A = this chain, B = another copy of it.
Amino acid sequence: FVEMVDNLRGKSGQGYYVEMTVGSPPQTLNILVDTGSSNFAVGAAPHPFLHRYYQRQLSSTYRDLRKGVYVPYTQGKWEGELGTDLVSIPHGPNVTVRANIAAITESDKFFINGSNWEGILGLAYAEIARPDDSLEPFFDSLVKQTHVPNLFSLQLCGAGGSMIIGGIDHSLYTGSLWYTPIRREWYYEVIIVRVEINGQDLKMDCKEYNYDKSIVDSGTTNLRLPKKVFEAAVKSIKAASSTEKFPDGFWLGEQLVCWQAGTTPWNIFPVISLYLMGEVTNQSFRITILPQQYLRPVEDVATSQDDCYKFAISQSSTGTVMGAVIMEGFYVVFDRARKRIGFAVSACHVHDEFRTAAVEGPFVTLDMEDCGYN
């Protein structure tokens, strides 16, 4: 797996991507690693933001499926043509598979102007595949057609990172891996059973933490929290960090907040602990994230010249989202074979000589199933 170490580039701001090849002969593309979707979708026309695009005409092995997809998002859409071709990951397992590929022919507010990737690797399950659950996702194909074991792991750094296809690499984490069940195979849905801020639980019904969903999503930047839990969550961190003062707009992601080089004090800000359903009845474990995770460098502002961070927590109609900023603290194992997700302390998380990112257990938590929304 030394092969696959450091095979990712990018950042929580713009996404993490892996190099892939598609078609015969191989056309190289940079492709967003997205555990929050299930389509393998690549730019296939000369949109001006794009460095590279898939040229089906140049591939002997391409096969048209004579079917189109139209894919709207909150504020983004794409449209494309469905087909299959031969797909490989240079710095992945040494195999080549025939995968579905959506050739993206039209899009709005999808590709990022200035980014270095040209497609999306949707790594979630068939259920949320577009247009329907009969379009086999890349990873299912990879598992079906080769002997690659049914799991992958992500270490997102932005301290790029590593995607280990088919296994786990011990160099990427410290301590022990703790596993939460995948509640259902659609998104990478999990159950948060308790939340503490600094060391004190919001003491709210845990069903709220997972209303209607909680998911792990390498293609969302932030920790996203339901309206009702975002209210409470911010209420507590806001009050936790009453040393200094910050505007109302900041907490709603409406303006950035700034300090000078070094003058950002993490320590006004509390660590955050999410307790996840464990593998055993009445057993949980917890993951603890630092302020460095929830306050992210907004790299360039010419209208300022300060350490200006954005508050990396936000609200949602669609549930908890554990995003890149949460994942950056951890080695995360998507153990599809066993319907579970493993978390360990990332060997590349950013830590002072004070606090740290932590994965701890067992804890005793009763009635954890009741925390899920049906």
- Chain A interface (Cβ within 8 Å of chain B)? 48, 68-72, 74-76, 79-81, 105-106, 108-109, 112-113, 130-131, 211-212, 226-227, 230, 249, 253-256, 301-304, 308, 310, 314-318
Indicate the member of A48, A108, A112, A253 with the most B CB atoms within 10 Å.
A108
Question: Which one, B230, B303, B318, contacts A79 given CB within 8 A?
Answer: B303
Known contacts A48-B48, A68-B304, A105-B302; can you find 18 more A-B pairs with CB under 8 A?
A68-B302, A68-B303, A70-B301, A70-B308, A75-B75, A75-B76, A75-B109, A76-B109, A79-B301, A81-B303, A108-B113, A130-B249, A130-B254, A130-B255, A226-B227, A230-B317, A315-B317, A317-B317
Min CB–CB distance A114 → chain B (angstroms): 8
Q: Check A227–B255 contact: CB distance below 8 A.
A: no
10 closest A-B pairs by beta carbon, nearest first, are A68-B303, A315-B317, A75-B75, A227-B317, A109-B109, A70-B303, A317-B317, A70-B301, A316-B317, A79-B303
A258's closest neighbor in chain B, by CB? B70
Question: Which one, B106, B113, B212, B249, contacts A302 given CB within 8 A?
Answer: B106
- A317–B253 Cα distance when bound, in Å, is 13
A-B contact pairs, 22 of them (CB 8 A): A68-B302, A68-B303, A68-B304, A70-B256, A70-B301, A70-B303, A70-B308, A71-B255, A72-B256, A74-B75, A75-B76, A76-B109, A79-B302, A80-B303, A106-B302, A108-B112, A108-B113, A109-B109, A130-B249, A226-B317, A314-B317, A317-B317
Q: Check A72–B253 contact: CB distance below 8 A.
A: yes
- A304–B68 Cα distance when bound, in Å, is 8
Chain B residues, Cβ within 8 Å of A81: 303
Chain B residues, Cβ within 8 Å of A315: 317-318
Chain B residues, Cβ within 8 Å of A211: 227
Indicate the member of A69, A212, A301, A303 with the most B CB atoms within 10 Å.
A303
Min CB–CB distance A318 → chain B (angstroms): 7
Chain B residues, Cβ within 8 Å of A76: 75, 109
Min CB–CB distance A245 → chain B (angstroms): 14
A69's closest neighbor in chain B, by CB? B303
Q: Check A72–B254 contact: CB distance below 8 A.
A: yes
A76's closest neighbor in chain B, by CB? B75
Chain B residues, Cβ within 8 Å of A69: 303
- A69–B71 Cα distance when bound, in Å, is 33
Chain B residues, Cβ within 8 Å of A108: 112-113
Min CB–CB distance A185 → chain B (angstroms): 16
- A72–B314 Cα distance when bound, in Å, is 13
- A226–B68 Cα distance when bound, in Å, is 32
Question: Which one, B74, B105, B302, B310, contacts A74 given CB within 8 A?
Answer: B74
Chain B residues, Cβ within 8 Å of A109: 75-76, 109, 112
Chain B residues, Cβ within 8 Å of A254: 72, 130
Chain B residues, Cβ within 8 Å of A79: 301-303
Q: Check A70–B255 contact: CB distance below 8 A.
A: yes
Chain B residues, Cβ within 8 Å of A112: 108-109
Chain B residues, Cβ within 8 Å of A303: 68-70, 79-81
- A301–B48 Cα distance when bound, in Å, is 21
Q: Check A255–B131 contact: CB distance below 8 A.
A: yes
- A353–B238 Cα distance when bound, in Å, is 55
A130's closest neighbor in chain B, by CB? B255
Min CB–CB distance A135 → chain B (angstroms): 12
Chain B residues, Cβ within 8 Å of A314: 317
Min CB–CB distance A173 → chain B (angstroms): 32
